[PDB]
Automatic annotation (TrEMBL):
Organism annotation: Chlamydomonas reinhardtii (Chlamydomonas smithii)
Location of this fragment in the whole protein: 257 to 385 of 415
Name of the protein in its database record: Uncharacterized protein
RNA sequence: GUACUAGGCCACGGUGGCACUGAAAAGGGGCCACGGUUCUUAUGAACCCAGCAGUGUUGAAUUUUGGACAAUCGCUUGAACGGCGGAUCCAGAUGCUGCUUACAAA
């Protein structure tokens, strides 16, 4: 009941009403700003620490061209098929950036010796790491 | 609705006219006239990069006077992995891109 909210219900964790019984007037309502989209792209790149445009753009078109069920459990599946997120799922680093340095050493051993594609992934199902 | 990719077909080879041969006609085949470029002791001859590189003007801007027949593919030759091809294949300079890139050591 409390948990498992809607996957796009992130407007309940930004500003709320009828749960704050004080300050009846002067309540901040959200304006028409696209800066939350730009900072959400910042939340996307900060989960990779990578240069802003090219990687998230290339993963965006790959996420469109892979399958067409939806864009929410599958676009983050395109995020999750990437190798630095995959290493963070294994737990070989404190965070994504340290894992990126570890793969920058080529300490990693994806599919035998090394990933053939270091910056882009993409780990298909059936690929050892 | 509008600049390219590669490739289909046509047209043209400084300009214009025409012919041989060939089954079919001419981009480094033949003849004449033009317009250029050089030289003559001036009488006349030689040549025509919209082939490759390269030069010069203009341009905001335009590449190396590279290697090679080995791969094709073509032409040719009955030896000979033969001969040739600025087609091509490989390298350069140069926009776009996809893709890596810390060294040490087995």
């Amino acid at each position: 009941y409390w948990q498992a909210r809607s996957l796009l219900h992130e407007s309940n964790l930004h500003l709320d009403a009828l749960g704050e019984n004080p300050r009846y007037l002067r309540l901040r309502r959200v304006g028409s700003l696209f800066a939350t989209k730009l900072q959400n792209v910042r939340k996307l790149r900060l989960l990779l620490g990578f240069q802003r445009r090219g990687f998230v753009q290339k993963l965006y078109e790959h996420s469109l061209l892979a399958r067409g069920s939806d864009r929410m459990w599958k676009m983050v599946c395109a995020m999750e098929a990437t190798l630095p997120m995959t290493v963070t799922r294994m737990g070989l680093a404190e965070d994504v950036v340290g894992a990126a340095t570890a793969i920058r050493n080529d300490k990693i051993y994806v599919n035998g010796k090394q990933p053939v594609m270091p910056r882009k992934g993409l780990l298909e199902p059936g690929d050892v790491v």
